[PDB]
Every structure is written in C-alpha cells, then in structure tokens.
Amino acid sequence: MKVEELIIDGFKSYATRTVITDWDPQFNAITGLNGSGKSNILDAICFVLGIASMSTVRASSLQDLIYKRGQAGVTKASVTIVFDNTDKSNSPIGFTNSPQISVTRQVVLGGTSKYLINGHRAPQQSVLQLFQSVQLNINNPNFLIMQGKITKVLNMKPSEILSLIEEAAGTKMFEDRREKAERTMSKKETKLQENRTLLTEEIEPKLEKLRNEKRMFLEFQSTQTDLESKQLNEKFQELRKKVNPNIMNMIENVEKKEAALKTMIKTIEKDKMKIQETISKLNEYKRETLVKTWEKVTLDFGNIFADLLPNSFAKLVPCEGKDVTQGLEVKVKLGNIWKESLIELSGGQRSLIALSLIMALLQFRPAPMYILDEVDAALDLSHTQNIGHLIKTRFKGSQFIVVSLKEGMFANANRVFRTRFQDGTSVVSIM
Amino acid sequence: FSLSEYLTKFQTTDDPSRELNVIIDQLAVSPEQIPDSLEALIDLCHDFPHLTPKLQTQLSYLISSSLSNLSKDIKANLGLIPQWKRHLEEYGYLIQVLLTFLQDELHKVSSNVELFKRDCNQMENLLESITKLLEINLSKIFQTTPEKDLFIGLFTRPLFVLLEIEPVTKVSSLKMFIQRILAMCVKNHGQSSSIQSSLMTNLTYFLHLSVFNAELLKLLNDEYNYPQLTEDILKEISTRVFNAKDTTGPKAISNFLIKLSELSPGIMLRQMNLVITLLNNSSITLRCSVVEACGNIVAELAQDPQTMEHYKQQIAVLIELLEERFQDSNPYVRTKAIQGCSKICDLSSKFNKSKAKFTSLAVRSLQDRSSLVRRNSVKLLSKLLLKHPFKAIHGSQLRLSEWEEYLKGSESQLNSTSVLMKLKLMIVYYKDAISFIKEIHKSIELISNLLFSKNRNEVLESMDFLVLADAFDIELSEFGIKKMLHLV
Amino acid sequence: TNRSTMMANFEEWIKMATDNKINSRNSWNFALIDYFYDLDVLKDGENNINFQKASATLDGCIKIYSSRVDSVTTETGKLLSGLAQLETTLVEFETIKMKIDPLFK
Numbered sequence A: 001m002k003v004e005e006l007i008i009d010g011f012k013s014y015a016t017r018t019v020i021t022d023w024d025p026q027f028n029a030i031t032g033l034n035g036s037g038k039s040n041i042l043d044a045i046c047f048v049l050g051i052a053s054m055s056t057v058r059a060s061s062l063q064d065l066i067y068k069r070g071q072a073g074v075t076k077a078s079v080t081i082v083f084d085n086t087d088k089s090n091s092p093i094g095f096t097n098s099p100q101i102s103v104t105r106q107v108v109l110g111g112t113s114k115y116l117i118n119g120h121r122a123p124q125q126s127v128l129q130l131f132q133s134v135q136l137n138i139n140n141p142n143f144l145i146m147q148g149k150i151t152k153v154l155n156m157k158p159s160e161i162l163s164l165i166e167e168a169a170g171t172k173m174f175e176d177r178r179e180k181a182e183r184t185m186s187k188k189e190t191k192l193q194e195n196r197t198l199l200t201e202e203i204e205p206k207l208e209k210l211r212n213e214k215r216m217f218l219e220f221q222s223t224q225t226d227l228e229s230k231q232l233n234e235k236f237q238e239l240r241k242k243v244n245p246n247i248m249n250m251i252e253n254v255e256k257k258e259a260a261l262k263t264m265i266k267t268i269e270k271d272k273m274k275i276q277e278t279i280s281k282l283n284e285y286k287r288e289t290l291v292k293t294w295e296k297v298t299l300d301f302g303n304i305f306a307d308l309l310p311n312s313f314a315k316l317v318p319c320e321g322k323d324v325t326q327g328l329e330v331k332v333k334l335g336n337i338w339k340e341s342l343i344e345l346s347g348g349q350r351s352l353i354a355l356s357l358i359m360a361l362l363q364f365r366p367a368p369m370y371i372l373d374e375v376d377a378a379l380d381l382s383h384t385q386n387i388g389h390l391i392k393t394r395f396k397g398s399q400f401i402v403v404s405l406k407e408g409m410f411a412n413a414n415r416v417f418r419t420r421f422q423d424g425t426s427v428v429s430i431m
Numbered sequence B: 001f002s003l004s005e006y007l008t009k010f011q012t013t014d015d016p017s018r019e020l021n022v023i024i025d026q027l028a029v030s031p032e033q034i035p036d037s038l039e040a041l042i043d044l045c046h047d048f049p050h051l052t053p054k055l056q057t058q059l060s061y062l063i064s065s066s067l068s069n070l071s072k073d074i075k076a077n078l079g080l081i082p083q084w085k086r087h088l089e090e091y092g093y094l095i096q097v098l099l100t101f102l103q104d105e106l107h108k109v110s111s112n113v114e115l116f117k118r119d120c121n122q123m124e125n126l127l128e129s130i131t132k133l134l135e136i137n138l139s140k141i142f143q144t145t146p147e148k149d150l151f152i153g154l155f156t157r158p159l160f161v162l163l164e165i166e167p168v169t170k171v172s173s174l175k176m177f178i179q180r181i182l183a184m185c186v187k188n189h190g191q192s193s194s195i196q197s198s199l200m201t202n203l204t205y206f207l208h209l210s211v212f213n214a215e216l217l218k219l220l221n222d223e224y225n226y227p228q229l230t231e232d233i234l235k236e237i238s239t240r241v242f243n244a245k246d247t248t249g250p251k252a253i254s255n256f257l258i259k260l261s262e263l264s265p266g267i268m269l270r271q272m273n274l275v276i277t278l279l280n281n282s283s284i285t286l287r288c289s290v291v292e293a294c295g296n297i298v299a300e301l302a303q304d305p306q307t308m309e310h311y312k313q314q315i316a317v318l319i320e321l322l323e324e325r326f327q328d329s330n331p332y333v334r335t336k337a338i339q340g341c342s343k344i345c346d347l348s349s350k351f352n353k354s355k356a357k358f359t360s361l362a363v364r365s366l367q368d369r370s371s372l373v374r375r376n377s378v379k380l381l382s383k384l385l386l387k388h389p390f391k392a393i394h395g396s397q398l399r400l401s402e403w404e405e406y407l408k409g410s411e412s413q414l415n416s417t418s419v420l421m422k423l424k425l426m427i428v429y430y431k432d433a434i435s436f437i438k439e440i441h442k443s444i445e446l447i448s449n450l451l452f453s454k455n456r457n458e459v460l461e462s463m464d465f466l467v468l469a470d471a472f473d474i475e476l477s478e479f480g481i482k483k484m485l486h487l488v
Numbered sequence C: 001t002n003r004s005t006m007m008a009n010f011e012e013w014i015k016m017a018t019d020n021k022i023n024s025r026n027s028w029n030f031a032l033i034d035y036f037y038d039l040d041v042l043k044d045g046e047n048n049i050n051f052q053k054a055s056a057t058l059d060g061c062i063k064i065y066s067s068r069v070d071s072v073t074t075e076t077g078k079l080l081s082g083l084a085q086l087e088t089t090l091v092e093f094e095t096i097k098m099k100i101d102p103l104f105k
C-alpha cells in the first residue's frame, strides 16, 4: 500500500480544493518558501490518520483546523488520501480484496471528525485499527518526526524507546488492546456480578414463594376434583381468589428460563477463564518476540550508526538493572570511549543517531510511508547530501516524503513538489 | 395410564421397520385395536430422533390417518365411554411425544432446505390431524373440568413451544393452522385463561409473535365472535407493569397494539377507556403505540356512519385527548399525534369543525424545537390545504381580499323565514373561511421564515408546502416564492 | 477440507467483528472464541504467531463477550417482567420552543 494522491480542501492554508497526484513511490520531497504550506501537507496526513494530540498540529482545537476558524466563508475542512494495494504483503487484514482504498476525514464548524472509507461512513475506531495494522499508528509514531523534534528524539523516556522498538515488529497494537480488553472485562464482570446479585435477591424469594404456593394449588385442584356439598364450597370459593389455576405453564417457563440463564452464566465464566489463559500465553510468546526484536534492532542500529559515522558506535541497554520490557536506553561511544551523558552530544550528532535508529527500524520491517520534517536542520551540507544519497540509492524500499529547505537533500530526489502562497491559499506544483 | 406419572416421567428425560409394519397391519383394521402393542408404539415414538426420515414419514402418516379415522368415528356415532377416554389419552400422549421430538432439531437449523420442507409437510399433516381431533367436543367425555383442561393443555403446550422459533411463523399455512386451532380452543372449549396467559408470555418474551397475536384476535372476532378474550388481553396490557431494564417487552406490546388497531378497531375500542390509563407510563414506545392505535381506530371507523353515530362520546374524547397530546416531553409522541391527525383529515367529508382545531394546533407546533415535529406539522398543513371542505362555492381559490369582500356583501345583505338562518349559516361559514385563510397565511409566513434549516427534509417539505400554497392564488405566496429563491 | 473451511470461517468472523455487526442476537452459535483458544489459526508455517490476527481475534472475542453479557441482562429483564405479576410527560408549550447567509458568504 502506497499513497497515490492527496486531496486537501479548506484545511489551514489550503482554503480551496487542491489535489496532489503522480506521487512517486521511490522518493518524494517538498520544497518552498517559509510559511508556504510544506508542513501543512504533513499536518493533513496526520489529521487523516486520526491525530489525538491536537497540539501536534499546532492547534488548540478542531476549530483552528478550518481555513480561518470558520469565519471567512470556509466551513467544511476535508482531507482525502488514496492508497494503492498492489502488493499483498502490505495489505490490511480486512481490505485485501478491495483495491485503491481511500480515507477521507471532514471537520465542519459544528460537527467533529466525520470519517469516510471508500465513500462509506466509518467510525474512528475502524480507521484507527486500519492504520495501526500497517504500522501507521499516529498516537505512538514510528515513521514520522515533526519539525523541530529531530533533536528531541533522544530525550524521550525509556518507555517511549520501548514503545518505538515494539512498533517495528508489530508488537504494539496489542498492549493498548490488552488494556482496553482488561477494562472491558472489568466493566462486564461488574455488570454480571450486579446482575447475578439482583437475580438472586429477586427470583429466589419469588421462587420459594411459588414453590410454597404449589402445594396450595395442588390442594385446591384436589378439592375441585372431589367436588364433582356446601362444606367443600366455602373453602373452594375462599381459595379461588388467588389460586392461579394455570400456574403450571408459567412455573415451567420460569424454570426453563432460570436453567438457560445458569447455562449462559457458566459459559460466560468458562470463556472468561479461557481468555485469561490465552492472554497469558500470548504475553509469554510476546516476551521472546520482543527479545528477538530488541536484539535485531540493537545490531542493525549499531551497524547503521557505524556506517554513517566512521568513528562512533551506539547500542541499546535495558533501563538500569531491571528487565528489557521495563524500559530501554541508548549508549553511544565516540572513538574508543563511551559517553555517560547523552546531553553533551552535538545536535547534529543526535539528529544522526535518530536517523540511524529510524533507518534501523526501516531495515527490520519497513513502514509503507516514512515522513521527515526538516531532519537536516542541525546537519551540515555534507551529512545532508550523504543522507539524501543513502535514502535514494542504498536503502530504497519504502516510500519517503521529506520536507527540506537545503538543496543537498532534494537535488537527487526522484519526485519534487513546490509549495507557493499565491492569494490566501497554498498551491502545490510539480518540480 | 396415569396423566401425572407419564407427564413427570417425560418432563425429566434425556429393526424398527418390522415393528412399524406390524403396527400398521394391526391398526389397518381399526384404530381401536391399540396388549403389548402400546409399549411398542411408545418405544418407537421414543426412538423418533434416531430413526430415518422415511421411517419417520410413514410413522407420522400412520398416526395421522389413525387419529383422523378415530375422530371421524367419534363424529359418526355421536361402559364404552371409559375405553374411548383411554384411547384418546393414549393418542394425545403419543402426539405430545412425537411433536415434542419433532420440535427438536428445528432450533438448531437456521439458528437443510429439503429437511425444512419435510418438517413443514409433517407439521401440516399433524395440524390437520389435531384439527380433526379438536373438531369434536370433549365436554361430555370428561365430566370434571381439571381433566379436560389438562387434556387440552396436552395438545396446546407443544405448539406453543414450537412457535418460539421464528422461521415457523413466517410460513403462511402453519401460522393459519395454529391460528384456527387456537381460535377453536378458545371458543369451542372455553379455557380463556390459559390461552391468554400463554399469549401474554409469548408476547413478553418474544417480538415476532405480536402480529400472530393480533391475527388470532382478529380471526376470533370475525368468525368466532368472542370479543371477551380481546377485552381481557387489553385489560391485562393496561394493568401490566414493566421493569426499567428490559425494553423488548414494551416494544412487543406496542407492535401488538398497532397491529390490533390496524386489524379490528371496533373490538379493541371498547376497552380503550382503560387503555388510556396506560398513557401515563414513562415508556416511549407504548405511548407512541397508543397514539398510533387511536389514530388508526378513528380513521378506519370513519367509513361506517353507524360506528361513528353509536360511539360519538368516546371517539370525541379520544380526538380531544389526541389534540391535547400535541405537546409532550417526547417529540416522537408529538410526531405520532400529528401523523394520526393527518390520517384523520385525509378525508374531508366529515368532522369539518375539527379541521380548524387541527390547523391551529399544527400552526402552533410549527414553532416546536424538534425538527421532525416541524416536518410533520408542515405535512399536516399541506394535506389540509390540498383538500378542504371550502370547495362548494368558488373552490380551489383562497383569496383574502375576495373572501373579505364576499363576507362584507353577505353582511350588507343581512343588514338590508328561511332568509334569517340561511344568511346566519352563510356568515358563519364565511367567518370560518376567513379564520382558516388567516391561519394558513400565518403558517405560510412561519414556514417562509423556517425555510433556512439544517435538515434537508424540512427544507424540502417547506418548499413543497409553499409550492402547493402558490398553486392556489394567495397574496402572500409570492413572498414565500421570493424567500425560496434565495435557496441557491 | 477442514483447514479451508476453518480458515474461511475465521476470516468471515473477523470481518464481521471489524464491521461491528455482532450484537446480542447473534452472540451465540459462534465458535470464534474457541478458535481463539487454539492458536493453530494464528500460527503460520514458520511456527510464529501473528499479532495482527491475534488483535483481530481478541477484538472479536471482546465483542462476543459484551454481546453475551447484554443478552444475559436482557434475559434477566424478561424473567423479572414475567415474575413482576404523573403529569411528567405533559409539559408547557413555552419550554419546547426554539426561543448561514449565502450572499454574505
């Protein structure tokens, strides 16, 4: 699956309906003047994938996502992205047969985030799992670095590093799913316990009252049979007020319903325990899966960092002395000595380390699309040109979209887009 | 044998061709031939699930033929009574066993097609046989009533259990057969208490049996002329209480009332006084069903003048309650009331006086917060304007100036024996016409202001109403068209 | 034979779970959770589990479990209703009253 075309209407600077097509799957770059709208394309891509942290798109709310907050004749802001599913390996779990999958997100002045899949309305959960299945989890990113955040990659907590490592092999989409499943089971268990307590406290007194009245009904039936003289008539007429002559059918129906409910509760409990063991065994397998993922990531990240910088190396360690699954840290050596503090490193050095890690996760299991937002800001011309050449020639594979202001990166780019500000709108043109 | 012992034994339970052929040979001479053969029949019936479909088919055919022959003999002829009773009891228990066993494997399927067709054919044959059995009267045979009630329940209970699964209800033949057998059970054998309780249980626990209940009640009312069962059912519905958790029960009750009102307004109208007391309930679907039932009853009873004449007081009370129900917390109840009023006003032959009240309520409801209520009010006004009694003279033309001039001329003519009240009626008619025209003008202005709405259906209905009002020459219609022109 | 039918059943059940068409009416008679118990469906020829299929099957199991709990709740409500045996709706008109320019745009 790879992006074919992108449609932006009424979103931020792109007030009008603009379409960008002929997206080269090899390597795409975006250039232009400051404030033209280069980062607005990346913001639209983040939005159509279901952004949760709104501050990432530099907006206080969805209202700021409109062209002028719905005050200058623009009310509907729509972003449409079309994908290609020629390769079955990268196909989603449930959209293999359907080709040319398109996702649209529309936000209006009053409404909030209407989603459409292939022209059909879908909830946010559908697109969320659809994008998480192809490593495009915007909530826990592994393929895009925002503007001004290339130097802050090494500043994230060891839990964030562990999450990023789990992104590469598909280990995530399961941890958050496990938490959601546990919350759902807790709520359902509370509801089921309340139902059982209420059912007991209501039916059991009623059931015993009906059982007690059963003998009175039998006695009334016996007297009625024996009738077919007045001495029986007074008791027959006094016991006829509340006898329920047809009580047998309702008693049998109530017994059948109670037995059915008991069977249902037993099946629910058995299924509960069964899911418990299944989750336990899945976690047991995931432990060694994450161990292998960590080993491969450490190896190829070290190799890549050694390749880019001849006299440096980096490698991953568990957080302090606890287990691997409780946090990860990066240790870098320059020459023949290791550095204790990561902060003393150069900004360009941190950018190179982050790029090497991203390329390592790419090598382990590439994402369908990789977004870069001015990752060369702290890097000099030589390193920028080397990174561009390595992306174009050495790696290939996944599709890259990069926003850069330096000629050394997009000079060899296969596809080049230019963003301009003509009249209150942003226009994207070829070359 | 013993009723209680065999019933308890069956209630708690987990080369046949040669015996079947022997049974066929013995029963060929006479069905009354049933020493040890009874045990063979019981064992063969207990082996029904494990037999082949063909052997099952011959078994069912033989049983049905023998039972039909016995029923025909009982028709023909009517110390020998007790052995008739024993034979009837044995055959009834055998039918219970076979039909309960046939009820199995039907819930599993469609939870194939040839099996379903074979089961339907066996059901048709068994229903024919049981109809022939119940065609006779069991009153003389069973002197005491508990034995008769137990014997009749022996036959009614298995069909009630088999009615649980949805696909059986869909087929017309089996549904019709069950309806007629239930009608004969209610009418010919009385016991109007067990059947009504079973129907209430089915309607509370299931949703698809409401139409079945309504059709059974309609069949009883038409041919079996026994409206007491419907009266008791409606009384139980009025006195029924529902929990705050379950919602399928009220929905099924609502569907049953809607279908009954669509089927037999007249029978169900008698107990409507107690049904109105159910309207105070906080349930939504039941209130909507009550409103819908009232509307359909008063609309369909409009065709017969005798029904209207004989029931003036209660129909007037119901119409007044429907008019008062135009304001409620639930917009859906208001929408149902407006729809009922539209169904009432679909004909302009009678109740001309209530037309002005309906117009006033619709104009008032035009300002309602709910959008659906506004669209239904627009629809009601459009229906009222499409056909009105104001057509005998100068029809299809509603001009305020011309009608005012005509009223002034009538006033001058009166100012200047039949003449007195003739002019009085003309003047009151012209005043009513002027009031109606003013109400329509105000509604047109309100709808013109209402044209700009978020919902598209409201806009479309407003445009339709304005076009209809423009069709008749109206001085303020051009303003509505001018406002509509800005919809671009 | 059996493998192909099992794969087709698992795929169609996963598709139904994804589209959220599973409710209380069709909660039972489905062995998707029993399919989840046996990991042979998730494990491929390389003897490694797939997290995508595992997550989809877990979602289906949660949906089925919630539908079953809802079915139990409604059955209890029906049983309670079977064993079970002012002026609030009427409100003033004043509280149900309401009380964009194309050329300007």
Ligand SMILES: Nc1ncnc2c1ncn2[C@@H]1O[C@H](COP(=O)(O)OP(=O)(O)O)[C@@H](O)[C@H]1O
Binding pocket: A012, A013, A033, A034, A035, A036, A037, A038, A039, A040, A041, A064, A065, A066, A067, A068, A069, A147, A403
């Ligand atoms: N809510 C908004 N309303 C109007 N314009 C916006 C809004 N959000 C962003 N923009 C415009 O979009 C442009 C985005 O520029 P950007 O692509 O970030 O430039 P660069 O790529 O040089 O950082 C800005 O110039 C800004 O004027």
Ligand SMILES: [Mg+2]
Binding pocket: A038, A039, A147
């Ligand atoms: Mg930028």
